[PDB]
């Protein structure tokens, strides 16, 4: 599913990401924008042979099992395929775990490069929340 900006913001708010670990909602919507373009089915292969999955491009090196990343850990304990669902629950719960591991949203390279220290409120501008 390809979310609209406001639809996704609303789904993320309901799932408890608004201010999760100090990160306002615009941040989460901004990251998803540049990570996957709002597409739950987005996948990308990294050079180490690990793959990124879903709306928040969660990495199989650490976070999920996709059965083809030798030596990786499964820190969210889900198949990576569960991150591609049109229901963002699994992606949102795994995100919460990533953002708490000490590095905050700097885990998401597109956030750090494209969202950090920008006007992120602009990504929830005008949505009925
Ligand atoms: Cl932080
Ligand atoms: Na893994």
UniProtKB/Swiss-Prot annotation:
Domain of life: Eukaryota
Keywords assigned: Allergen, Antimicrobial, Bacteriolytic enzyme, Disulfide bond, Glycosidase, Hydrolase, Secreted, Signal
Gene Ontology terms describing biological process: cell wall macromolecule catabolic process; defense response to bacterium; defense response to Gram-negative bacterium; defense response to Gram-positive bacterium; killing of cells of another organism
Entry's EC annotation: 3.2.1.17
Gene Ontology molecular function: any one: beta-N-acetylglucosaminidase activity
Location in the cell: Secreted
SMART domains listed in its UniProt record: LYZ1 (SM00263)
SUPFAM superfamilies: Lysozyme-like
Chain residues that bind substrate: 101
Coarse class of the protein's main subcellular location: secreted
Occurrences of domain C-type lysozyme (ranges): 1-129
Enzyme class: hydrolase
Subunit structure: Monomer.
Function, in words: Lysozymes have primarily a bacteriolytic function; those in tissues and body fluids are associated with the monocyte-macrophage system and enhance the activity of immunoagents. Has bacteriolytic activity against M.luteus.
Family: Belongs to the glycosyl hydrolase 22 family.
Name the UniProt record assigns to this protein: Lysozyme C
Record gene name: LYZ
